[PDB]
Amino acid sequence: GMSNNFLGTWKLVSSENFDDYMKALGVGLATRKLGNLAKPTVIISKKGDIITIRTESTFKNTEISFKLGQEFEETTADNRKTKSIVTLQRGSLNQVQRWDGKETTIKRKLVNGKMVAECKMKGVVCTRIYEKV
């Protein structure tokens, strides 16, 4: 299953094309202004087969808890109510969010010791890189 190298606390060190990713989700300017200035912290823990991903920022905190392959109700940082699933493809943690007939994905894979999150929406791609502490 999920490699134990995901487990721990991660810190954003790079974000590319985040403003345009938020634009695609319908995020307003003022909210985007703060989402760009945010340097979140992502904690990934595991209790049994239930994986938890927690995001901590001064602006918004979030937390999801799921079993791989099982749909679950999620409330996103921008307050979307999504029916989401997390799958594992070649050691990549791929999260899909569906709402209002729309859909976006967050793919998280480890690269040379760093967690790389790919955000995708209608051909708009954002790349966020985290370093472990």
Ligand X SMILES: CCCCCCCCCCCCCCCC(=O)O
Which residues participate in the annotated binding site for (9Z)-octadecenoate? 108, 128-130
Name residues contacting ligand X, limited to 10-49 (CB under 6 A).
22, 27, 31, 35, 38, 40, 42
- Closest distance between ligand X and the C-beta of residue 132, in Å? 14
Query: What residues does 57 pair with on adjacent strands?
Result: none
58 contacts Cl ion (rule: CB under 5 A): yes
Phi and psi at residue 122, to the nearest 5°: 55, 45
Name residues contacting Cl ion, limited to 105-124 (CB under 5 A).
none
- Closest distance between ligand X and the C-beta of residue 110, in Å? 14
**Interface with ligand X (CB under 6 A), residue from 44, 51, 64, 106:** 106
Rounded Cα distance, 19 and 119, in Å: 11
Residues 6+ apart with CB under 8 A from 12: 38, 39, 40, 41, 42, 128, 129, 130
Contact 128, 107 (CB under 8 A): no
- Closest distance between Cl ion and the C-beta of residue 117, in Å? 16
Q: Which amino acid is at 108?
A: R
Interacting span for Cl ion (CB under 5 A) from 21-29, 32-40, 99-107, 117-125: 32-40
Query: What residues does 129 pair with on adjacent strands?
Result: 14, 116
- Return residues touching ligand X (CB under 6 A): 22, 27, 31, 35, 38, 40, 42, 55, 57, 59-60, 76-78, 106, 117, 119, 128
